Amino acid sequence: VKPNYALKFTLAGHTKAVSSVKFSPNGEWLASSSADKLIKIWGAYDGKFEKTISGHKLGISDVAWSSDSNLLVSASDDKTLKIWDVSSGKCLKTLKGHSNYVFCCNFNPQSNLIVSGSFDESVRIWDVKTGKCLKTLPAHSDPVSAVHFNRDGSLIVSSSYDGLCRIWDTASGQCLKTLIDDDNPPVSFVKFSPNGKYILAATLDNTLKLWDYSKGKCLKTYTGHKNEKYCIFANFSVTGGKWIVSGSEDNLVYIWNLQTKEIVQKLQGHTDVVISTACHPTENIIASAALENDKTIKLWKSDC
């Protein structure tokens, strides 16, 4: 069983490298962030450009949606995160506290907290309503590449160039688990599975790994792509077949069968490193986004 993702739309508009694409929880919208300091909103089903959101003083590495598809948070080189009202485009809060570039961000499912990771080697947990920093976790000893809440928001997973992936108790800020590798290549990406039982982690040695969080055991490895420089975002695809989806430094989107680990599709068309991919919440739709020699987002659709 293989997917048949085919190109549907190419979304042009960003004037510099695109860093992150995310589908709204309600499936309605795609948000993109870019080195051009802009957030753009696009229709998920027709690819139609909606609006430009601006205010960051420097490039934006990441953007994430609240549970109600009404708010966005962005992580910038200007050392801030911003919370935005999607419908008005207005900046609601500026989250200040990191001492350097902010690279990654997420709302908890309840969408009252935001977690961020920074070049400053810390993970911060912020109050959505007030914008105040609630906790600063001495998370890592190198830049933090990814931060993600599990399904009930009770855990955070973080990854860093220090070679570790850590799991944190949200309430107390205590580290519950460290995943260590003997060679410790930089961990460039991490995310929980939809059910929260597993973690998917990328390392900068051309490798994706599925870890049993509960047991601390690697269950799967996914290879064949190129990933030795960029923090490339990867995904579980669960709407049709059960896939792993990633960008790659050879300008392709890679799709693997989660259980067998076999490459099932490679998506051709981008003209630069595919740094971001997103999987639609309800439909078999992938968004992909590439760096400065491409600057476009592509939307792909499959029957399974």
Ligand X SMILES: Cc1cccc(C(=O)Nc2cc(-c3cnc4ccccc4c3)ccc2N2CCN(C)CC2)c1
State how far the Cα of 121 lies from the Cα of 248, in Å rounded to an integer: 25
Choose among 177, 163, 274: nearest CA to 227.
274
Q: Is 204 in the site for ligand X (CB under 6 A)?
A: no
Half-sphere exposure of 243 (CA within 13 A, CB side): 30
Q: Is 65 in the site for ligand X (CB under 6 A)?
A: no
The least distance separating ligand X from the CB of residue 9, rounded to whole angstroms, comes to 20
User: Are the C-beta atoms of residues 200 and 191 closer than 8 Å to each other?
Assistant: yes
Q: Is 19 in the site for ligand X (CB under 6 A)?
A: yes
Q: Is 62 in the site for ligand X (CB under 6 A)?
A: yes
Site string for ligand X, 124-153 (x = CB under 6 A): -------------------x-x--------
| Cα-Cα end-to-end distance for the chain | 9
The least distance separating ligand X from the CB of residue 278, rounded to whole angstroms, comes to 10
Choose among 216, 228, 220, 234: nearest CA to 279.
234
Q: Which of 275, 278, 285, 297 binds ligand X (CB under 6 A)?
A: 275
The least distance separating ligand X from the CB of residue 165, rounded to whole angstroms, comes to 15
Rg for the chain, CA atoms, rounded: 17
The least distance separating ligand X from the CB of residue 166, rounded to whole angstroms, comes to 16
Q: Is 256 in the site for ligand X (CB under 6 A)?
A: no
User: Between 252 and 275, whose beta carbon lies closer to ligand X?
Assistant: 275
State how far the Cα of 96 lies from the Cα of 111, in Å rounded to an integer: 19
Q: Is 249 in the site for ligand X (CB under 6 A)?
A: no
**Which residue is at the shortest CB distance from ligand X?**
59
Contacts of 167 (CB under 8 A, 6+ apart): 155, 156, 157, 175, 176, 177, 178, 199, 213
Q: Is 59 in the site for ligand X (CB under 6 A)?
A: yes
Half-sphere exposure of 141 (CA within 13 A, CB side): 4
Choose among 148, 28, 150, 169: nearest CA to 87.
28
User: Between 2 and 16, whose beta carbon lies closer to ligand X?
Assistant: 16
The least distance separating ligand X from the CB of residue 56, rounded to whole angstroms, comes to 9
Site string for ligand X, 79-108 (x = CB under 6 A): ------------------------xx----
Q: Under the rule (CB under 6 A), what is the footprint of ligand X?
A: 17, 19-20, 35, 59-62, 103-104, 143, 145, 161, 230-231, 233, 275-276
